[PDB]
Amino acid sequence: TNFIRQIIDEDLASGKHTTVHTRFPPEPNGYLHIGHAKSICLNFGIAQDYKGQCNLRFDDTNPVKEDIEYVESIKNDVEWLGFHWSGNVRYSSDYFDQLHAYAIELINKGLAYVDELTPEQIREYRGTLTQPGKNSPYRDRSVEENLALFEKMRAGGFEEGKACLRAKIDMASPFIVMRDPVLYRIKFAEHHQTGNKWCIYPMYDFTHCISDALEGITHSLRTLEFQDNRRLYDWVLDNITIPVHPRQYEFSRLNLEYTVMSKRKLNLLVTDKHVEGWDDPRMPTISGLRRRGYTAASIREFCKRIGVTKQDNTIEMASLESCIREDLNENAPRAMAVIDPVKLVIENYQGEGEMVTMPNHPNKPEMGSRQVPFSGEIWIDRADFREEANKQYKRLVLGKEVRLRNAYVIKAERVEKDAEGNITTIFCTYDADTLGVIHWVSAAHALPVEIRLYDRLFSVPNPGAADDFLSVINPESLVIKQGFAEPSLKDAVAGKAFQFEREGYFCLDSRHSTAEKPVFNRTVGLRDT
RNA sequence: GGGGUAUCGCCAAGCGGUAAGGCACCGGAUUCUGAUUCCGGCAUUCCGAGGUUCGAAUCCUCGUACCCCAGCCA
Ligand SMILES: Nc1ncnc2c1ncn2[C@@H]1O[C@H](COS(=O)(=O)NC(=O)[C@@H](N)CCC(=O)O)[C@@H](O)[C@H]1O
Numbered sequence: 001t002n003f004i005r006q007i008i009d010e011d012l013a014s015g016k017h018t019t020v021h022t023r024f025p026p027e028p029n030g031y032l033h034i035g036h037a038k039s040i041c042l043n044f045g046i047a048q049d050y051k052g053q054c055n056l057r058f059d060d061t062n063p064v065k066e067d068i069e070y071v072e073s074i075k076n077d078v079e080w081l082g083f084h085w086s087g088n089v090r091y092s093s094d095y096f097d098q099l100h101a102y103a104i105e106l107i108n109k110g111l112a113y114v115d116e117l118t119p120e121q122i123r124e125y126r127g128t129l130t131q132p133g134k135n136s137p138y139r140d141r142s143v144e145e146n147l148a149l150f151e152k153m154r155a156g157g158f159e160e161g162k163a164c165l166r167a168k169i170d171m172a173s174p175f176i177v178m179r180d181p182v183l184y185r186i187k188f189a190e191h192h193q194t195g196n197k198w199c200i201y202p203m204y205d206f207t208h209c210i211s212d213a214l215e216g217i218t219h220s221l222r223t224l225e226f227q228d229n230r231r232l233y234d235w236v237l238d239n240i241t242i243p244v245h246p247r248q249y250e251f252s253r254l255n256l257e258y259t260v261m262s263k264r265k266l267n268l269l270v271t272d273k274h275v276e277g278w279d280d281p282r283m284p285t286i287s288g289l290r291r292r293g294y295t296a297a298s299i300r301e302f303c304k305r306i307g308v309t310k311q312d313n314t315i316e317m318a319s320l321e322s323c324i325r326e327d328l329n330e331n332a333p334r335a336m337a338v339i340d341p342v343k344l345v346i347e348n349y350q351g352e353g354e355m356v357t358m359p360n361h362p363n364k365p366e367m368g369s370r371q372v373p374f375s376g377e378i379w380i381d382r383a384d385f386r387e388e389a390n391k392q393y394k395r396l397v398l399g400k401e402v403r404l405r406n407a408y409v410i411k412a413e414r415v416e417k418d419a420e421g422n423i424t425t426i427f428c429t430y431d432a433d434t435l436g437v438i439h440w441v442s443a444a445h446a447l448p449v450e451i452r453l454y455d456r457l458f459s460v461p462n463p464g465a466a467d468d469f470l471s472v473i474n475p476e477s478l479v480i481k482q483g484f485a486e487p488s489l490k491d492a493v494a495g496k497a498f499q500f501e502r503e504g505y506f507c508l509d510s511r512h513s514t515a516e517k518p519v520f521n522r523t524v525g526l527r528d529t
Numbered sequence: 530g531g532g533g534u535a536u537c538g539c540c541a542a543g544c545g546g547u548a549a550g551g552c553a554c555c556g557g558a559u560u561c562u563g564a565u566u567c568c569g570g571c572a573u574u575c576c577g578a579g580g581u582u583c584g585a586a587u588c589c590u591c592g593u594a595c596c597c598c599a600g601c602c603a
Pocket residue numbers: 025026027028034035036038039059208221222223226252253254255261603
């Protein structure tokens with residue numbers, strides 16, 4: 001429960017409403033991030049919890065910043081998260097004609113006029129946060145001139161920035177938004193939905209209140225930066241002929257430590273090629289997390305946990321991670337994989353090999369079991385063998401022994417180093433019938449694998465607050481390793497996650513895995529204390 | 530100037546009866562994953578200072594900190 005849901009309960013009870021109708025209205029000017037997920041869960045979640053409706057509307061009022069690839073990727077993300085919208089997908093562009101007609105109604109009521117102040121003068125005439133603005137010398141044109149001048153704008157008779165439509169309100173309002181807000185501006189750009197039919201586009205504030213109203217929206221839910229906008233929102237609907245007046249509510253926007261959360265900054269990371277793309281596994285985008293291995297249910301869980309309030313906040317990576325660990329720990333089948341391999345021979349072993357059974361899930365037999373190949377030449381992680389080490393070290397130590405996961409107990413005996421003195425192969429002996437603990441892979445049956453370990457994109461908690469956030473990127477946000485996995489992973493499918501015992505949760509695709517050389521992304525490491 | 534928010538490290542309930550929960554953390558028990566699971570601990574105070582009240586984090590007052598607004602962006 002959150003304040004907004006309680007308001008809804010109140011509205012329902014009092015009969016003010018009989019159905020709830022929300023909307024998710026992103027601008028297709030980039031991909032969606034975990035923040036947008038919070039909005040998606042909120043808006044669609046309320047819809048299904050109350051048997052209401054949630055529309056998917058592309059707020060496409062600015063052609064030069066938008067692209068068809070973005071709308072495509074957005075429908076994709078919303079669908080992947082697990083939500084369905086009301087009827088067809090909607091586009092603000094579907095209302096250009098309506099918007100144009102409503103602009104004409106305002107002009108007719110003397111509430112709007114064509115201003116010819118340059119883009120620099122409008123700022124000069126706007127006043128400041130502490131000084132009132134001043135009326136434009138064109139503010140009192142007659143209905144007829146405005147009507148004529150507006151038509152010229154629509155017809156392309158004005159070069160960009162030479163004219164625009166403004167609402168006639170109050171140049172001396174403490175709300176800078178009421179200082180004669182621009183309704184329409186000229187843009188000779190092609191629109192991904194309307195082609196070149198328009199050379200004038202409606203602004204956000206004008207478009208949104210009308211789109212919500214025509215769509216029958218009952219609760220327009222957005223973020224805190226739009227609180228000031230509410231006054232203009234109500235002003236517009238109050239002055240045009242439209243039957244419904246949706247109520248607005250603002251919640252705080254999500255912030256995650258060690259990353260940025262604005263399409264503008266994320267896009268910069270894409271354009272300057274510092275990440276592979278919007279869906280790079282290190283990105284806080286929804287598609288990036290998906291490729292990283294997060295489940296749509298783990299994201300819905302996270303959104304549910306962080307809550308919806310009016311307080312500024314920055315969640316910790318640990319929280320998001322706990323969500324993904326909870327899911328995978330329960331559903332991900334276990335497998336063996338060695339990231340930093342070192343040859344280990346069991347001089348004691350006779351033959352070409354045998355087969356040992358391993359649980360597909362240690363704490364869940366119902367998830368079945370599988371046959372895994374064991375032999376005399378195996379790979380173990382270079383970090384699980386110490387010639388000495390303290391008393392805490394519970395792994396392989398020269399002279400001492402360790403249990404091979406779901407297999408035999410081996411005793412390190414003789415080690416062998418190379419030129420620079422690095423160990424090349426560890427010699428051990430195994431007990432006839434013996435079935436800490438370390439994982440392993442039979443060298444002979446091992447599947448060569450590329451393992452991509454990921455880490456926080458940035459070095460600091462709040463990279464957004466840095467002068468040059470790019471200069472604070474973590475050089476080790478991605479580190480690639482070549483290792484060995486049990487033959488079993490030969491069937492691994494993209495997106496599907498596995499737990500590589502004693503390491504973490506991994507998944508395929510990564511956009512790079514082939515048939516010859518598979519690529520696994522570390523979604524997240526195991527809780528290691 | 531206007532609009533907002535201040536409750537345990539990070540989130541977050543609480544709407545006058547006198548501090549939920551999650552994440553994190555600290556112990557202990559399990560365990561062929563130093564994982565998981567499982568017990569136990571963790572704000573005598575709710576930005577601060579007065580005030581109304583039998584009693585407030587929840588009502589009032591004066592403060593203080595932080596966030597958003599001066600795109601023909603959204
Ligand atoms: N970090 C964050 N945390 C949580 N919610 C966030 C968010 N960033 C954006 N949002 C919300 O996502 C929705 C779409 O984002 S967006 O594509 O930028 N488009 C817009 O903001 C505007 N076209 C919508 C205006 C409105 O809804 O009043 C918008 O509704 C916006 O409020």
